Amino acid sequence: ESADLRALAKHLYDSYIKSFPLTKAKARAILTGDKSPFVIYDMNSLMMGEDKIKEVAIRIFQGCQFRSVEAVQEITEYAKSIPGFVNLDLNDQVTLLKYGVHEIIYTMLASLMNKDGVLISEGQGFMTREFLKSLRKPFGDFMEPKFEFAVKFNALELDDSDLAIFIAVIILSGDRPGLLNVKPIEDIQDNLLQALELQLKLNHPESSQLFAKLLQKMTDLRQIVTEHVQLLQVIKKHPLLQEIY
Amino acid sequence: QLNPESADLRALAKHLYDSYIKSFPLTKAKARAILTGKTTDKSPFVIYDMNSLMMGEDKSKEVAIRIFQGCQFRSVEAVQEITEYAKSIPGFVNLDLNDQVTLLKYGVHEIIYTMLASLMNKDGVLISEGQGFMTREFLKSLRKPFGDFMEPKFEFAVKFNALELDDSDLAIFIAVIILSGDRPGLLNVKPIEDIQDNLLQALELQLKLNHPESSQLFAKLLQKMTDLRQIVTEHVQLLQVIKKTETDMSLHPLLQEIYKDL
Ligand SMILES: O=C1NC(=O)[C@H](Cc2ccc3cc(OCc4ccccc4F)ccc3c2)S1
């Protein structure tokens, strides 16, 4: 049984590294300790950051949207490496990605976060939590919930090898609305779940029930996504540019 | 065979099942016996329309409000039963009293909807200790803003019920729900996490022993916690609406305190 499961873990890790330029390993090393990021903590510091790397709040949001569009393509490439995924119904592949990317983006953003701020543009920059919190409403409440989640998620001390499998688990979620053929999606998720469980037992033998703790984080994660979507609708209150986004 | 660690986990499972049976008068076992017709003596009266609802009160508001307040009062009762169960969970009553309150505050509705699934099939739900069965379509026919409030619970139940869990499983799962270290405003997280660790280990073993052919049932069960949270959040949203449109509908203060700043 375990031959396939070790193959799956390694394959997903290799694909994860190929698809995502800034890994957690590289992010934690930047956030702790040889070249340091430019820190954006202030309106004046943001201004210099742009010369180095409408109004301030809007342009940060637009910056976030640009990155998110990039991440959607990274995630999609990654998904296509997950054994079985490309053999699913094409509408189902689109549905899984459509409803999965937000969950994945905030999961992976935790890798770039500590309790005080978030790495930006390939780790070249670091924007503080308090500066993001200071932005005028409704932009000030945009990132805070993601920081609160990240603190709780990061306490699990997952590495890139664990996260590669967890992200795959998220993508293969059989409860997405409008799926045509749930069976093979659940069947693949079952195999990914088995692989994640073994990976956490081998990689973190002294962390009791880490597998269970990790799956429980989906509860807060989906809640975060639902609140975020609602805030995106509130924010909706060059034509080609709006099309891209 | 077994070892001392898994032996302790078995005793914990047995203790929790025992307390569950003592705390909850209507078990899944009894609910399924009523629903599936293991019955000449246990058959429910079925409410599927106004007249059958009238006739059923032989075995003082308008109908939608009366039904909605029925759910409220039943919820109030459930909170009592769940609080009694919680006290049996080893370590729970030794926690900081404020954390006891917080865990119940955030846990009780998730437990209520979990256990409500036991009383449900795709066509309706048992009421009045199993003596009645109200149809899903009758519930969906109630006037705005009440016609939609049970649908999310039925959709969840049908998916939840496909896991085919029994009371012995549920007993440990609901303990896991209560002992969550990620509830907002908890003072001392570590003691709570340590208890949950133990409960998770016990649930995992229980599911392995009770459902040996059911692959990754533990994981799939844990994944359903996200569904529960979504039911709670959506219901709160619906209550806000109901309250504004029906300025004459009351909300029991126990429930109102549970929902306050949730
Ligand atoms: O605003 C609220 N806050 C809460 O805590 C409550 C949550 C809630 C909702 C529905 C329920 C249905 C139940 O059985 C079925 C049932 C019972 C009587 C009448 C009709 C029924 F269909 C049992 C408990 C229930 C609890 S209502």
HEC per residue, A99-120 = HHHHHHHHHHHHHCEECCEEEE
Other Cβ atoms less than 10 A from the Cβ of B171: the count is 28
**B180 → chain A, closest CA residue:** A216
Residue A146, token pair as written in the block: 């993601």
B209 to chain A, any CB pair closer than 8 A? The answer is: no
Q: How far is B174 from chain A (nearest CA, A)?
A: 14
Q: Is A15 annotated as a binding residue?
A: no
3-state secondary structure A132-193: HHHCCCCHHHCCHHHHHHHHHHHCCCCCHHHHHHHHHHHHCCCCCCCCCCHHHHHHHHHHHH
Q: How distant is the Cα of B31 from the closest Cα of chain A, in angstroms?
A: 26
What is the C-alpha separation between B241 and B152, in angstroms, rounded?
16
Using the Cβ of A216 and the Cβ atoms of chain B, whether some distance falls under 8 Å is answered with yes
User: Chain A within 8 Å of B245 (Cβ-Cβ)?
Assistant: no
Find where tokens 């949001």 sit. A61
Give the helix/strand (H/E) hosting A38: strand A38-40
* Per-residue CA distances from B260 to B111, B236, B240, B243 (Å): 18, 10, 12, 14
Give the technique used to solve this structure: X-ray
Residues 6+ apart with CB under 8 A from B155: none
Chain-chain contact of A218 with B223 (C-beta, under 8 angstroms):
yes
Which of A190, A212, A220 shows the shortest C-beta gap to B182?
A220
Q: Rounded to an integer, what distance in angstroms lies between the CA atom of residue B155 and that of residue B160?
A: 9
Task: Answer yes or no: are the C-beta atoms of A35 and A41 closer than 8 Å.
Answer: no
Q: Are strands A38-40 and A125-128 parallel, antiparallel or unpaired?
A: parallel
Residues of A in contact with B226 (CB under 8 A): 218-219, 221-222
- CATH number where B162 lies: 1.10.565.10
Q: For A232-235, which contacts have Cβ atoms below 8 Å and span 24 or more sequence positions?
A: A234/A138, A235/A61, A235/A138
A218: CB partners within 8 A, 6+ apart: A103, A170, B223, B225, B226
Q: Residue A187: list chain B partners with CB under 8 A.
A: none
| DSSP H or E stretch at residue A15 | helix A2-19
- On whether any CB of chain B is under 8 Å from the CB of A22, the answer is no
SS3 call for A37 = coil
Where does residue B195 fall: left (phi above 0), alpha (psi -120 to 50 degrees), or beta otherwise?
alpha
C-alpha span between B173 and B171 (Å, rounded): 6
Q: Which residue in chain B has the smallest CA separation from A209?
A: B197
Residue B39 one-letter amino acid: T
Instruction: Specify whether the CB–CB gap between A27 and A108 falls below 8 A.
Output: no
CA distance A222 to A103: 7
CA neighbor of A153 nearest in space, from A112, A208, A98: A112
Resolution (A): 2.1
Residues with CB under 6 A from ligand 1: B 67, 70-72, 74-75, 109, 112, 116, 125, 127, 134, 139, 150, 239, 255
User: For residue B20, what are its two tokens?
Assistant: 């569950």
B110 touches A: beta carbon within 8 Å: no
Are A135 and A143 within 8 A, CB to CB?
Answer: no
Which long-range contacts link A227-234 to residues 24+ away (Cβ below 8 Å)? A227/A145, A228/A102, A228/A106, A228/A142, A228/A145, A228/A146, A229/A102, A231/A138, A231/A141, A231/A142, A234/A138
| Cα–Cα nearest to B82, from B136, B139, B19 | B19
b/e burial code for range A73-100 (CB count within 10 A of at least 16 → b): ebbbebbebbeebeebeeebbebbbebb
- Kindly give the distance from the C-alpha atom of residue B162 to the centroid of ligand 1, in angstroms, as a whole number: 22
- On whether the CB atoms of residues A97 and A178 are closer than 8 A, the answer is no
Peptide bond into A138 cis (omega under 30): yes
Alpha-carbon span A25 to A19, nearest angstrom: 15
Establish if B223 touches chain A: CB-CB under 8 angstroms. yes
Q: How far is it, in rounded angstroms, from Cα A26 to Cα B68?
A: 54
Residue recorded with tokens 């009523």:
B34
The nearest CA of chain A is from the CA of B225 a distance in Å of 6
Which chain A residues are Cβ-neighbours of B222 within 8 angstroms? 212, 215-216
Residue A96 sits in which domain range?
Answer: 1-245
Specify the number of domains making up chain B.
1
Interface test with A, best of B8, B195, B215, B226 (most A CBs within 10 A): B226
Q: Is B135 exposed, middle or buried (0-12, 13-18, 19+ CB in 10 A)?
A: middle
The minimum-distance atom of ligand 1 relative to the CA of B76 is 5
| A50: closest CA of chain B, how far (Å) | 37
Q: What number of other Cβ atoms are within 10 A of residue A191's Cβ?
A: 19
Give just the sign of the alpha carbon dihedral A86, A92, A97, A100: negative
Place of tokens 């009791």: A208
Count of other CB atoms within 10 angstroms of residue B87:
12
Provide the β-strand partners of residue A118: A113, A127
* A:B CB pairs within 8 Å: 50
Residue for token digits 């990754």? B216
Please tell me which of the candidates B204, B225, B230 has its beta carbon nearest to residue A216: B225
Tell whether residue A16 is among the known ligand binding residues: no
- Residue A28, H or E segment: helix A24-31
CA–CA separation, B192 and B102 (whole Å): 12
At residue B46, φ and ψ (nearest 5 deg) are -100, 125
Q: What is the 3-state secondary structure (H, E, C) of chain B?
A: CCCHHHHHHHHHHHHHHHHHHHHCCCCHHHHHHHHCCCCCCCCCEEECCHHHHHHHCCCCCCHHHHHHHHHHHHHHHHHHHHHHHHHHCCCHHHCCHHHHHHHHHHHHHHHHHHHHHHCEECCEEEEHHHCEEEEHHHHHCCCCCCCCCCHHHHHHHHHHHCCCCCHHHHHHHHHHHHCCCCCCCCCCHHHHHHHHHHHHHHHHHHHHHHCCCCCCHHHHHHHHHHHHHHHHHHHHHHHHHHHHHCCCCCCCHHHHHHHCCC
Nearest protein Cα to ligand 1, atom 10: B71
Ligand 1 centroid – CA B140 distance (Å) = 14
Three-point CA angle B144, B146, B151, nearest 5°: 120
Q: How close B256 gets to chain A, by Cα (Å)?
A: 21
**How many of the other CB atoms lie within 10 Å of CB of B142?**
18
Residue B204 · residue B218 · CB < 8 Å: yes
Q: Of A194, A216, A221, which is closest to B222 when you measure between CB atoms?
A: A216
A125 close to A45: Cβ distance less than 8 angstroms: no
Give dist(CA A112, CA A120) in Å, integer.
Answer: 8
Contacts 24+ apart (CB under 8 A), A179-182: A179/A92, A179/A95, A179/A96, A180/A89, A180/A91, A180/A92, A181/A88, A181/A89, A181/A92
Tell if the CB–CB gap between B216 and A190 is shorter than 8 Å.
yes
Angle at B181 between CA A201 and CA B111, to 5 degrees: 100
CA–CA separation, B152 and B160 (whole Å): 12
B89 and B175 in contact (C-beta within 8 Å)? yes
- Say if CB B115 and CB B174 are below 8 A apart: yes
Helix (H) or strand (E) holding A4: helix A2-19
Residue A239 CB burial class (10 angstroms; 0-12, 13-18, ≥19) = exposed
Which atom in ligand 1 lies closest to the alpha carbon of residue B238? 1
Beta pairing class for A117-120 and A113-114? antiparallel
Question: Cα separation of A219 and A163, whole Å?
Answer: 17
Find out whether A20 and A74 touch, Cβ atoms under 8 Å: yes
Nearest to A146 by CA among A239, A64, A43: A64
CB-CB contact of A228 with A145 (8 Å) = yes
- Supply φ then ψ for residue B76, to 5 degrees: -55, -45
Neighbours of A212 (CB within 10 A): 22
Q: Are A103 and A222 in contact (CB under 8 A)?
A: yes
CA-nearest residue to B177 within chain A is: A216
Quick check: bond before A21 cis, omega within 30? no
Q: Is A39 helix (H, G, I), strand (E, B) or coil?
A: strand
What is the atom index within ligand 1 of the atom nearest the CA of B251?
1
**Which ligand 1 atom sits closest to the C-alpha of B78?**
24
B48: CB partners within 8 A, 6+ apart: B124, B134, B135, B137, B138
Residues in chain B closer than 8 A to A175 (CB atoms): 159, 227
